[PDB]
């Protein structure tokens, strides 16, 4: 049955308390709602005093099987103070002096032999006590009587901590006592409190729990709680340095684990950053030492402009592969975008740092060290010109380290060579514009190859294999985002669609973004979205992409890249390349890397009379890719390392096609 609130007002306290004793809390209508009916109930100081006295007698008697309705009693009194906080009508409940009337009721539960945690009743009894203290008030004597529970919980930690019920019980108990105390001395001097200096046994009880040391995956949080609340309750111990010393030991115990960071946060936030010795601890040096631990190895490429700081367990082979993959993705990008001059002088992206943790587990600490999101596969922060990720097994993620490195590398390129101004800030963000584009063209460009342009990724086509009816975004629906997870895959679908079926629009888009021509880009999104035929054209493309899944591949860096190629005179490679790609006025720079040397060769290609920018682009591609493939037929193994692109399209006074052409490959001739 359900009991109403207007009813209870018309009862004796004797019948009311025995009624509350039998019922569960949820049966009462609008118990936390403020009404004209709930006012009269809590308005009677005698009514609530009865409920407390009933709780005190109920606390003196309760057993392992019999609740004695303590759960219900607590929640009712809790509802009172809740309403007494938000409403001027029940202001006497808000007063701390009246809340002290609950203390003998709490003590009754504590002095009862059934105060230990064991049965489902005893577990939720401690739960309801802690939840009450938060809303009511406690004193030193109430606090110190919790010690038999925390000692018991610590003594059988390995069994209890993994249990939700037993765990939550102890947590809520401490969480609640801290809650009351922290509000009780809100801006008052913490030494003026009646508990200050007497809480030693409870404060020392948190030490033992927090400094348990021999912890496992299932019990870390419990010791974590211990340390966090040791700091927060350590503000009520006369010996200040005793507490800080204990926190410092917690750092040293689990050095570079979760609790270590918590303990350090506790010293800087609660104790001003002054250690037990009396001098300021170096928070920055700790974070720096923490990073060096997880990222011990360093790999440097392109004259120290491409640095990978990686975990001790990520293969050198992978490092090398990731370097070469960046070159594959880069060249495709500059081809499509038609620019390779970085947009701004002396930015942080002048040197790209890539930090790769050993595992998702080890990746989580990145948030503590570098203060960036970790609820992701990877993350590029443009103002730092740094992007973070982790090595992964196939079972941890469907995307490999190279694949995600490639998606992220695209963002580096986008921010550097395409979108003028900082990433996320600028005209192209004042309104929602490039959300589909940034993620879309990223997944797309991650499909870069050496000689085949950009190719679909099997796993992305994998995603597209799902119910056709709705779900499949409209062209207009992709162009305009707040939506669901599939946005990256249909955003890609738009990018590939344009790349394969309508390159002019795709080039015009990129040029607009490059020239920061907001009115142009918007006109393009307009024409695409207002066109029903263009959507039908797009809807068909998705089907072709789905159809390609069977014989699709995952474009990755070839093993040929890793082969020891052998010496070839540097002059020979340049001449042979210059001749092959028909380049005039050529320069070349060389650059030292960790495992090898490399050359970037620039030049001007000038062909025959133009067929129009977009036919020209299409031909140039076929031309240049062919030059890369034919060069690879030469007996020098190092020709398979070549990547090439073309930028800055124009035509001469005689309509002859003109591009700037760039070549990049391995160099085995020294100096
Ligand atoms: Zn992305």
| Binding positions for Zn(2+) | 407, 411, 439
Technique of determination:
X-ray
51: tokens are 């409920």
Q: Is 496 left (phi over 0), alpha (psi -120 to 50) or beta?
A: alpha
Structural domains in the chain, sorted by start: 1-557 (no CATH), 558-670 (3.30.980.50)
3-state helix, strand, coil split of the chain in percent (to 5) is: 60, 10, 30
Among 461, 464, 457, 418, CA closest to 437 = 418
386: three-class secondary structure by DSSP: strand
Burial class, 191, CB count within 10 angstroms (exposed 0-12 / middle 13-18 / buried 19+): exposed
- Residue 449, token pair as written in the block: 């190859």
Annotated binding site: 382, 407, 411, 415, 419, 421, 439
591-607: string of b/e by CB count within 10 Å (b at 16+)? bebbebebbbbbbebbb
Alpha-carbon dihedral sign for residues 365, 445, 331, 382: negative
Active site residue 408: yes
Burial code (b: 16+ CB inside 10 Å, e: under 16) for 417-435 equals bbbeeebeeeebeeeebbb
Distance 536 CA to ligand 1 centre (A): 27
**Measured in Å, how far apart are the chain's first and last C-alpha atoms?**
91
User: Any residues with CB less than 8 A from the CB of 443 and at least 6 apart, and which?
Assistant: 407, 457, 460, 488, 489, 491, 492, 495
Q: Separation of 368 CA from ligand 1 center, angstroms?
A: 22
Which residues contribute to the annotated binding site for Ca(2+)?
382, 415, 419, 421
Element (H, E) at 94: helix 91-94
Where does 414-450 have alpha helices with state H? Answer: 427-430, 435-445
Both tokens of 411, joined, read 């963002």
CA gap 90, 154 in Å, rounded: 41
User: If you measure from the C-alpha of residue 435 to the centroid of ligand 1, how many angstroms do you get, rounded to a whole number?
Assistant: 10
Rounded Cα distance between 269 and 33, Å, is 37
**Alpha-carbon distance 280 to 262, whole Å?**
17
CA of 600 to the centre of ligand 1 (A): 28
Backbone angles phi, psi at 591, to 5 degrees: -145, 130
Largest Cα–Cα distance in the chain? 106
Q: Is 225 strand, coil or helix?
A: helix
CA distance 322 to 314: 11
Query: What is the full DSSP assignment across 581-610?
Result: TTEEEEEEEEEE-SS-EEEEEEEEEEEEE-
CA within 13 Å, CB half, 168: 11
- Strand order across the 643-651 sheet: 583-592, 597-609, 656-667, 643-651
CA torsion 327-333-339-343 (nearest 10°) is -80
Ligand 1 geometric centre to CA of 311 (Å)? 23
Tokens coding 476: 């207009």
Resolution value (Å, 1 decimal): 3.2
Closest CA to 73 of 39, 108, 40, 98: 108
β-bridge pairing 386-390 and 352-357: parallel
Choose, from 362, 402, 408, 443, the residue flagged as catalytic: 408
Strands (E), 507-642: 583-592, 597-609
Which residues have their alpha-adjacent CB atom under 5 A from ion ligand 1?
439, 442
Other C-beta atoms closer than 10 Å to the C-beta of 635 total 7
- State the Rg of the chain over Cα: 34
Cα 266 from Cα 274, distance rounded (Å): 11
H and E: helices and strands count for the chain: 32, 9
């Amino acid at each position: 049955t359900m009991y109403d609130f207007e009813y209870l007002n018309g009862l004796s306290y004797t019948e009311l308390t025995n009624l509350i004793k039998n019922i569960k809390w949820n049966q009462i209508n609008g118990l936390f709602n403020y009404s004209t009916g709930s006012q009269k109930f809590f308005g009677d100081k005698n009514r609530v005093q009865a409920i407390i006295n009933a709780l005190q007698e109920s606390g003196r008697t309760y057993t392992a099987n019999d609740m004695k309705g303590i759960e219900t009693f607590t929640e009712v009194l809790r509802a009172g103070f809740y309403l007494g906080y938000y409403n001027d009508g029940l202001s006497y409940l808000n007063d701390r002096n009246f809340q002290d009337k609950c203390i003998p009721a709490m003590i009754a539960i504590q002095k009862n032999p059934n105060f230990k945690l064991g049965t489902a009743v005893q577990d939720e009894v401690i739960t309801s006590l802690g939840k009450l203290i938060g809303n009511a008030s406690a004193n030193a004597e109430v606090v110190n009587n919790c010690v038999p529970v925390l000692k018991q919980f610590r003594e059988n930690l390995n069994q209890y901590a993994p249990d939700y019920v037993k765990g939550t019980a102890v947590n809520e108990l401490i969480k609640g006592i801290e809650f009351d105390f922290s509000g009780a001395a809100y801006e008052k001097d913490v030494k003026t409190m009646p508990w200050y200096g007497k809480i030693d046994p409870f404060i020392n009880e948190l030490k033992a729990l927090g400094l348990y040391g021999n912890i496992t995956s299932a019990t870390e949080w419990a010791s974590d709680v211990g340390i966090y609340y040791l700091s927060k309750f350590g503000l009520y111990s006369t010996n200040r340095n005793d507490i800080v010393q204990s926190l410092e030991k917690a750092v040293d115990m689990y050095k570079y684990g979760k609790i270590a960071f918590v303990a350090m946060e506790r010293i800087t936030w609660d104790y001003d950053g002054i250690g037990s010795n009396g001098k300021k601890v170096d928070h920055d040096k700790f974070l720096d030492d923490a990073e060096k631990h997880y990222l011990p190895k360093t790999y440097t490429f392109d004259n120290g402009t491409f640095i990978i700081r990686a975990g001790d367990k990520v293969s050198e082979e992978k490092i090398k592969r990731l370097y070469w993959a960046s070159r594959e993705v880069k060249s495709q990008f500059h081809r499509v975008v038609g620019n390779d001059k970085a947009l701004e002088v002396g930015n942080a992206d002048d040197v790209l740092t890539m930090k790769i943790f050993n595992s998702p587990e080890e990746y989580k600490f990145n948030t503590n060290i570098n203060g960036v999101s970790t609820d992701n596969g990877g993350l590029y922060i443009e103002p730092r010109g740094t992007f973070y990720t982790y090595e992964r097994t196939p079972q941890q993620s469907i995307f490999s380290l190279e694949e995600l490195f490639r998606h992220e590398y695209t963002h580096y390129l986008q921010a550097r060579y395409l979108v003028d101004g900082l990433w996320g800030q600028g005209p192209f963000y004042e309104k929602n514009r490039l959300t589909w584009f940034d993620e879309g063209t990223a997944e797309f460009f991650a499909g870069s190859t050496r000689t085949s342009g950009v190719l679909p990724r099997k796993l992305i086509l994998g995603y597209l294999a799902k119910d056709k009816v709705d779900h499949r975004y409209s062209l207009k629906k992709t162009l305009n985002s707040d939506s669901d997870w599939m946005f990256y895959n249909y955003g890609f679908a738009v990018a590939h669609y344009l790349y394969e079926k309508d390159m002019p629009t795709f080039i015009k888009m990129n040029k607009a973004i490059l020239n920061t021509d907001v009115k142009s880009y918007d006109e393009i999104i307009k024409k695409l979205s207002d066109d029903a035929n263009k959507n039908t054209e797009y809807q068909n493309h998705i089907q072709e992409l789905v159809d390609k899944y069977q014989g699709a591949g995952i474009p990755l860096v070839s093993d040929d890249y890793l082969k020891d190629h052998g010496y070839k005179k540097a002059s020979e490679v340049y001449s042979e390349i210059s001749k092959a790609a028909s380049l005039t006025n050529t320069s070349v720079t060389a650059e030292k890397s960790q495992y090898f040397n490399t050359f970037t060769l620039r030049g001007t290609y000038t062909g025959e009379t133009s067929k129009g920018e977009f036919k020209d682009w299409d031909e140039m591609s076929k031309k240049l890719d062919g030059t890369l493939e034919s060069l690879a037929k030469n007996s020098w193994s190092g020709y398979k390392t070549l990547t090439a692109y073309f930028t800055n399209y124009r035509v001469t006074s005689d309509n002859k096609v003109q591009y700037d052409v760039v070549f990049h490959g391995v160099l085995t001739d020294n100096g």
